Amino acid sequence: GISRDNWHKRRKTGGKRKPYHKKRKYELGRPAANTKIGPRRIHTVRVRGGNKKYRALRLDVGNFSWGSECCTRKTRIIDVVYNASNNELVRTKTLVKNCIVLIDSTPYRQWYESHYALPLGRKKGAKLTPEEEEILNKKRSKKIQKKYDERKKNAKISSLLEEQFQQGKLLACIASRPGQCGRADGYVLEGKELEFYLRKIKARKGK
Amino acid sequence: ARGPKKHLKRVAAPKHWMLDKLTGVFAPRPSTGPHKLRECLPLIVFLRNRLKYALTGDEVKKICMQRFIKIDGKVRVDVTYPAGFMDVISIEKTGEHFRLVYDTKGRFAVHRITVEEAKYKLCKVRKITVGVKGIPHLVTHDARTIRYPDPVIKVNDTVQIDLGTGKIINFIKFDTGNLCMVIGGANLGRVGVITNRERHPGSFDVVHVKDANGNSFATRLSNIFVIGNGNKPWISLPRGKGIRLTVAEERDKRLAT
Amino acid sequence: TERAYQKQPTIFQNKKRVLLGETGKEKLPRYYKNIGLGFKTPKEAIEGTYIDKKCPFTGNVSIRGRILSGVVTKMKMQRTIVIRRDYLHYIRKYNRFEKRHKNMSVHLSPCFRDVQIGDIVTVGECRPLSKTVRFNVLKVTKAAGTKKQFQKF
RNA sequence: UCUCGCCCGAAGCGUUUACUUUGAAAAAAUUAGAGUGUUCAAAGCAGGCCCGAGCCGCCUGGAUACCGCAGCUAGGAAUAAUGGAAUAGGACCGCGGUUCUAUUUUGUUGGUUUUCGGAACUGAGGCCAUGAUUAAGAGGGACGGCCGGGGGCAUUCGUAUUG
RNA sequence: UACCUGGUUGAUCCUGCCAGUAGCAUAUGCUUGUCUCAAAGAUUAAGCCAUGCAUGUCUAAGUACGCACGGCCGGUACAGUGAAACUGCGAAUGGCUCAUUAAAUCAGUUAUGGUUCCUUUGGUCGACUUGGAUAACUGUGGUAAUUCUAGAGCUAAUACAUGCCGACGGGCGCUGACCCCCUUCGCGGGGGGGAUGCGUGCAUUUAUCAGAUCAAAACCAACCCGGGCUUUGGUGACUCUAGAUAACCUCGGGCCGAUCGCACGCCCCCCGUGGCGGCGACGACCCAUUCGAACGUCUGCCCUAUCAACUUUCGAUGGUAGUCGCCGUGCCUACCAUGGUGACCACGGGUGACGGGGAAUCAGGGUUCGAUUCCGGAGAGGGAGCCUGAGAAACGGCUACCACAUC
RNA sequence: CGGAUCCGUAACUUCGGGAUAAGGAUUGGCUCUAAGGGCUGGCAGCCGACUUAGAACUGGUGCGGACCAGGGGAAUCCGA
RNA sequence: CCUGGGCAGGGCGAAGCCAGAGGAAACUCUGGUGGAGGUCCGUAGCGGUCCUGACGUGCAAAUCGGUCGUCCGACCUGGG
Numbered sequence A: 001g002i003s004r005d006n007w008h009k010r011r012k013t014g015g016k017r018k019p020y021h022k023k024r025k026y027e028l029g030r031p032a033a034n035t036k037i038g039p040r041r042i043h044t045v046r047v048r049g050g051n052k053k054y055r056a057l058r059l060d061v062g063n064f065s066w067g068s069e070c071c072t073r074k075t076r077i078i079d080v081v082y083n084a085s086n087n088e089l090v091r092t093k094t095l096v097k098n099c100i101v102l103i104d105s106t107p108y109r110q111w112y113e114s115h116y117a118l119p120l121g122r123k124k125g126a127k128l129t130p131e132e133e134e135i136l137n138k139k140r141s142k143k144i145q146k147k148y149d150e151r152k153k154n155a156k157i158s159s160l161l162e163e164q165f166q167q168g169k170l171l172a173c174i175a176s177r178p179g180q181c182g183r184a185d186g187y188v189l190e191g192k193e194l195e196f197y198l199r200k201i202k203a204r205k206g207k
Numbered sequence B: 001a002r003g004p005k006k007h008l009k010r011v012a013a014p015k016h017w018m019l020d021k022l023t024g025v026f027a028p029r030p031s032t033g034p035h036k037l038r039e040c041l042p043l044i045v046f047l048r049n050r051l052k053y054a055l056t057g058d059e060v061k062k063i064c065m066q067r068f069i070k071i072d073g074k075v076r077v078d079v080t081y082p083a084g085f086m087d088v089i090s091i092e093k094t095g096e097h098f099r100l101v102y103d104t105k106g107r108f109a110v111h112r113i114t115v116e117e118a119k120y121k122l123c124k125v126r127k128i129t130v131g132v133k134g135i136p137h138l139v140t141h142d143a144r145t146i147r148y149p150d151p152v153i154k155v156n157d158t159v160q161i162d163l164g165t166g167k168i169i170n171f172i173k174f175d176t177g178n179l180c181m182v183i184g185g186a187n188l189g190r191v192g193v194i195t196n197r198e199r200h201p202g203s204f205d206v207v208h209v210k211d212a213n214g215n216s217f218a219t220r221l222s223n224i225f226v227i228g229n230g231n232k233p234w235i236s237l238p239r240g241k242g243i244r245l246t247v248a249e250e251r252d253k254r255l256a257t
Numbered sequence C: 001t002e003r004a005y006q007k008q009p010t011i012f013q014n015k016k017r018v019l020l021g022e023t024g025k026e027k028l029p030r031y032y033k034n035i036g037l038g039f040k041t042p043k044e045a046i047e048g049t050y051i052d053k054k055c056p057f058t059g060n061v062s063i064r065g066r067i068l069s070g071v072v073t074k075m076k077m078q079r080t081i082v083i084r085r086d087y088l089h090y091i092r093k094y095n096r097f098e099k100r101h102k103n104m105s106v107h108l109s110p111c112f113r114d115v116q117i118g119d120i121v122t123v124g125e126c127r128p129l130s131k132t133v134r135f136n137v138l139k140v141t142k143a144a145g146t147k148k149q150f151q152k153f
Numbered sequence D: 001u002c003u004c005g006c007c008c009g010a011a012g013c014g015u016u017u018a019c020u021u022u023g024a025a026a027a028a029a030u031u032a033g034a035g036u037g038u039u040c041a042a043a044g045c046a047g048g049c050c051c052g053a054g055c056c057g058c059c060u061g062g063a064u065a066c067c068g069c070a071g072c073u074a075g076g077a078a079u080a081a082u083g084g085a086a087u088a089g090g091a092c093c094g095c096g097g098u099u100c101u102a103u104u105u106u107g108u109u110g111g112u113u114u115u116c117g118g119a120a121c122u123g124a125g126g127c128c129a130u131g132a133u134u135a136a137g138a139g140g141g142a143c144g145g146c147c148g149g150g151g152g153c154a155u156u157c158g159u160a161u162u163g
Numbered sequence E: 001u002a003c004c005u006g007g008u009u010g011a012u013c014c015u016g017c018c019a020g021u022a023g024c025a026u027a028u029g030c031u032u033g034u035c036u037c038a039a040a041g042a043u044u045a046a047g048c049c050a051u052g053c054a055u056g057u058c059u060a061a062g063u064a065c066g067c068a069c070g071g072c073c074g075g076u077a078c079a080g081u082g083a084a085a086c087u088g089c090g091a092a093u094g095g096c097u098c099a100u101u102a103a104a105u106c107a108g109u110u111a112u113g114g115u116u117c118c119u120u121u122g123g124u125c126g127a128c129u130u131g132g133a134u135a136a137c138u139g140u141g142g143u144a145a146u147u148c149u150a151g152a153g154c155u156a157a158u159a160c161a162u163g164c165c166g167a168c169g170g171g172c173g174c175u176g177a178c179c180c181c182c183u184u185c186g187c188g189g190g191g192g193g194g195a196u197g198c199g200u201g202c203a204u205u206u207a208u209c210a211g212a213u214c215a216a217a218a219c220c221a222a223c224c225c226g227g228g229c230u231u232u233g234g235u236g237a238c239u240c241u242a243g244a245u246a247a248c249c250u251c252g253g254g255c256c257g258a259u260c261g262c263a264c265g266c267c268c269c270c271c272g273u274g275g276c277g278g279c280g281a282c283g284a285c286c287c288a289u290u291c292g293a294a295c296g297u298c299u300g301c302c303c304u305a306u307c308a309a310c311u312u313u314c315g316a317u318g319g320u321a322g323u324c325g326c327c328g329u330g331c332c333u334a335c336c337a338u339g340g341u342g343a344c345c346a347c348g349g350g351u352g353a354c355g356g357g358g359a360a361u362c363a364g365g366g367u368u369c370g371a372u373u374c375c376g377g378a379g380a381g382g383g384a385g386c387c388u389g390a391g392a393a394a395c396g397g398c399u400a401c402c403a404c405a406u407c
Numbered sequence F: 001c002g003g004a005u006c007c008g009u010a011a012c013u014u015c016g017g018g019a020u021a022a023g024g025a026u027u028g029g030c031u032c033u034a035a036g037g038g039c040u041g042g043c044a045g046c047c048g049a050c051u052u053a054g055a056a057c058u059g060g061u062g063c064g065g066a067c068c069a070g071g072g073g074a075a076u077c078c079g080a
Numbered sequence G: 001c002c003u004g005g006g007c008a009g010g011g012c013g014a015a016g017c018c019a020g021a022g023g024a025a026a027c028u029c030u031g032g033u034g035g036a037g038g039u040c041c042g043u044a045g046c047g048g049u050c051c052u053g054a055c056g057u058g059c060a061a062a063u064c065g066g067u068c069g070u071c072c073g074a075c076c077u078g079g080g
């Protein structure tokens, strides 16, 4: 019986409006679903007009888009930090439209190896992971093309994203509503937004 | 109320249906079709009230499912199927090809045309868009959505349509010097050459039109139907040019008898 | 600068400019929208600094419907001001008029500086921004007196 | 203004109303009102004709007027208030310097520069008949010869009453 | 019909009210021959209801082994009428009343680019038939009875599900074995082809890229021809529509016929055991129109100051993000600012106040009603919550409370 | 009832009061968060006190846990 | 009369002072600050309302236990 109506409100001045409706059907209100970080669990909601709404009660997998290089892979959701609207929902770990998700940087490493060779995040050992790092041997002139992609374009993912990849986590902003479409779809924080949310999380951990 | 309306009152009926006060309580409400309720004419009104074919409406309801009356090629099973301006009504046995043109009084005037012109039909473009795989779609005011129309069609045009094939032909642009016919408002049924359009940024523009023997009027873009091409109407219109002279000239006509 | 949690309307920030290494100007990636209607976009929306979701030149606020005019009365409300529309009312019985006015809150975009009290401002209808704000500041016309003179201190 | 195809169209466009005259504007019923012998009329939108049934037929009506106030468009400039130039930070014309952006062309692609179209700022002079309607038997203020039991403070005189 | 008359005084003139005058609409007294129309439980009691009805529906075209009737009728399932039940649509319309409601509903005018939309009308719709279950039916029961129902057997489809062939494989993105030419001792450099493998179409959810008004050269490095060539649409406007890029496509799972009827002919051919299949009822992913809803924008409402400041901890005003909702919204949440309205009557009260088109009243200007047949709103004793469904907080739908009230 | 915190407080009146009027909610433990300061250099860096507010978790509704400690209201007579 | 000694903490918040707001003026309103009083709860101190409690040949020829009134003063008290 949740009513999002405006006829029970006050006027421009603040005069109490006289009630005469009975909270009709075309002004529905459904209770909130705090989207946890458990397994994938989505229920259905009937919509006025015969449509279907996918209510995500808790989610595990997610979809996130890298910003600059225009790539997108699947990503397991790890942790919820800095809601920036309600800090209680950080501890509640509720997925909303504008929130920050820790991307596991492992599904981006295969694409970064396959297109942007001589990768990073390999613990400065240079002995481990016989991945096919140097097995394919880069026979034809696509080796020179990858040299253009690696040195002429120069592939700079400099010190902020460097330290994030060397810590094995990535800071992502959600760009979709989890309670509406059932998808925790988002993008990767880059540059000015990256240093801004990094400063906010660093201040939250410091003071 | 709740949901859509379903009845219609004779008192709340529109004026251009020629309904009575003593006959019945409920008016024939037309079904959902290509035309709105204010610019339509039911088949039960067309066959019962106007042409005097059946006295009751039950006879019309019987014959429309006895599969005689067809609109634009296909047979209508509904007794209250809505029609509109510039439609072809033919029933299958004699020469009866009624064109729904507008009278000078604003009423649906019958016009028995020959078969060679009854094969063809004009229609006004409502809007134009693009869709799946980048193809052009055209929406007609007669609820006709056609793909790959032409690239040289402005939104406010009148294109000839073939009822046998569903193909458009012989478009004409909205230009000064075209013969148009006003379909809506207080000056409907007015046939005149387009004289001057005036644009306004407030989502509505005005058009001043002129016609023969020194007369001029003005209307809005949502009520204009182009009918001609340089003082040459593609469809022959009954009772002269459809000109409203004067109520006193109508009295002089009735005295001349 | 910014003093909120996030301000980024539509434009993607990084053009991956790190190819030689340089700071450069960062005010070039700015969204620029023309409202049409024969009204000129001010240069504050061109070379400004602000980020406004409800600006008609920056946000997705479409301008439609009616165009009215009023006079600016107050400033104390944040990023939106209150206008006054003085008008007369024809009365059939007594056969003369009377003064009536209805104050409305209107969204003042931060690009319009020199918004001093007493100037004739133009407003336009938009989508409902908030509970009382429905119009949008569209053109500031009057200088609200003589700006040439100056006072002591 | 001829950039848009010696004139026109288009576009710069109103400083913003009040007031007026057209035009669209809406929904019928109702009101005024056209026509019609419902036996007149209240009504209603009907009916009128030719034909000895044999023309497997015609013609016409179901209009118009009003619809305050509110909103839109096109003229009018009389009355009623508002904008200009006073510490000039005034309007035009063509020249100095600083700075930015987009696309036409060097047969095509990549790099540098100029002219060009425009925006912003600064410096110097000319061009304006270079800029203030005169002062209401309106009002405010100043002057100076008065005016009056106007008001406040202090002082003096007068007879009478009582003791 | 632009209309007065009598009444204060011994008499006259004046202000002044009272009373006669005429409609209008409620009741009532008396009387009443014809005929055409015609309002009618509004005023008090939106108080209570016995009884009887007001919502059902089948086509040649979804499902016929009904025990009912008959076709001639022999047998290779099935033809005809067909009660009843499974299925779909409608019962969110109509009718009734005006109890609440004072910029609230409404009325004039504008728009959803900020939404949904049954049903019709158009575009789109690129394995010789698969599995459980069940109603009607038959037996079998319960209590005093309801539109009460479980238990045993079986049966059907447009019930609910599972799920296939075609169709050549085109083109593109990324890897990619291999291969051609020139130069160089080689290394290397430059230009041009290319077998495998992974992704494809429309919608859903992201992020990114390129996208229209305008005309002259001067230098350096690469290449086509005989000094010289390359481009989606609309609005007043877009974060509009449409392309391309990488991936998700959600088990409560978007679509890409595991339908039915008609009249029936023809052909390649080795039998047809295969095609040539024409018309017509169902929505099916989406896009428009049509019917309708919704919050919106400007203007307009009776009386009252013995109603002068009102709103703000249970948002009052605004901003920043988020939740919910179909969408824009203090509709809700966290933080921040202290705002917003008013003597041009704010706020609070009363209305024997539903708002209008209209009705009565005959100079003009006005005054009083409008519950009532047409539009819109509200409600089904009060008031709250909800299933189904596109559309309801429905009441001739359901659940709980109060007041009634039946067996 | 009794302490403390946050709302709200009538009749009357000498306008000071009545008033801790009356009447409601919370009170424990353990974690955090925010705010309130000092001293040095031409905004940055070092050093400490007990207060307030908000939030989460949890204990058998238990929290002034002992002790500390106003029952209240309507009136009449008399004396300020 | 002279001469000395003493009176824990809290509540109410007077004059004066500061800042802000309304108004044309007269003037009004709001938040602090201040610490006033034969002022309120209350300890020590001083008296003794009630239980007519305990004793009542008692501890005492007038005392004790609760419940008390007042406690910055018209306050209590030593010595001369």
Ligand SMILES: [Mg+2]
Pocket (backbone or CB within 6 Å): none
């Ligand atoms: Mg710490």
Ligand SMILES: [Mg+2]
Pocket (backbone or CB within 6 Å): B001
């Ligand atoms: Mg109804």
Ligand SMILES: [Mg+2]
Pocket (backbone or CB within 6 Å): none
């Ligand atoms: Mg003298």
Ligand SMILES: [Mg+2]
Pocket (backbone or CB within 6 Å): none
């Ligand atoms: Mg008299």
Ligand SMILES: [Mg+2]
Pocket (backbone or CB within 6 Å): none
């Ligand atoms: Mg009288």
Ligand SMILES: [Mg+2]
Pocket (backbone or CB within 6 Å): E315
């Ligand atoms: Mg809140």
Ligand SMILES: [Mg+2]
Pocket (backbone or CB within 6 Å): none
């Ligand atoms: Mg009422």
Ligand SMILES: [Mg+2]
Pocket (backbone or CB within 6 Å): E361, E362
């Ligand atoms: Mg009259």
Ligand SMILES: [Mg+2]
Pocket (backbone or CB within 6 Å): none
């Ligand atoms: Mg009148």
Ligand SMILES: [Mg+2]
Pocket (backbone or CB within 6 Å): B001, E376
């Ligand atoms: Mg409605």
Ligand SMILES: [Mg+2]
Pocket (backbone or CB within 6 Å): none
């Ligand atoms: Mg409404």
Ligand SMILES: [Mg+2]
Pocket (backbone or CB within 6 Å): none
């Ligand atoms: Mg209802």
Ligand SMILES: [Mg+2]
Pocket (backbone or CB within 6 Å): none
């Ligand atoms: Mg009903």
Ligand SMILES: [Mg+2]
Pocket (backbone or CB within 6 Å): E396
């Ligand atoms: Mg009933």
Ligand SMILES: [Mg+2]
Pocket (backbone or CB within 6 Å): F011
């Ligand atoms: Mg009392």
Ligand SMILES: [Mg+2]
Pocket (backbone or CB within 6 Å): F018, F021
């Ligand atoms: Mg007391």
